[PDB]
């Protein structure tokens, strides 16, 4: 229903930028979770993941986003701790939430995580 995220942050390239995805209005376990980026002047990029009844946390392999993903199902809070930070990591990140099984989906969305890594 509602995906609350961690606030903005500004770091230098190369570090680890932590995030948190606060769940309000759904069971955080019943839903495989994610962190998807909408980058400036870019398409939506599905990046970060976690499954519902297991630990998935696969990414686009490519250059791995590598961002550390974990869950506190008491907090219902999905984390994005972004390893190998860089200037391109500047973007609006959306921890997303999927539907029950099918051809999809991402039902609801985070409000976005403003992220800027630069000088």
């Amino acid at each position: 229903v509602k995906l609350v995220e961690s606030g903005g942050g500004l770091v230098k390239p190369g570090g680890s930028l932590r995030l948190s995805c606060a769940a309000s209005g759904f069971t955080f376990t019943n839903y495989g979770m994610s962190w998807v980026r909408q980058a400036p002047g870019k398409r939506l990029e599905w990046v970060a993941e976690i499954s519902s009844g297991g630990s998935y946390t696969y990414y686009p392999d490519t250059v791995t986003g590598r961002f550390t993903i974990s869950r506190d199902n008491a907090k219902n809070t999905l984390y994005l701790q972004m390893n190998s930070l860089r200037a391109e990591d500047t973007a609006v990140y959306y921890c997303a939430r999927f539907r029950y099984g099918g051809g999809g989906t991402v039902d609801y969305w985070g409000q976005g995580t403003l992220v800027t890594v630069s000088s």
Binding site: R99, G104, D107
Partner: peptide, 13 residues
């Protein structure tokens, strides 16, 4: 605005 679902398998939702 945040992204939003539309359709899945284009035939559906």
């Amino acid at each position: 605005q945040a992204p939003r679902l539309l359709i899945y398998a284009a035939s559906n939702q």
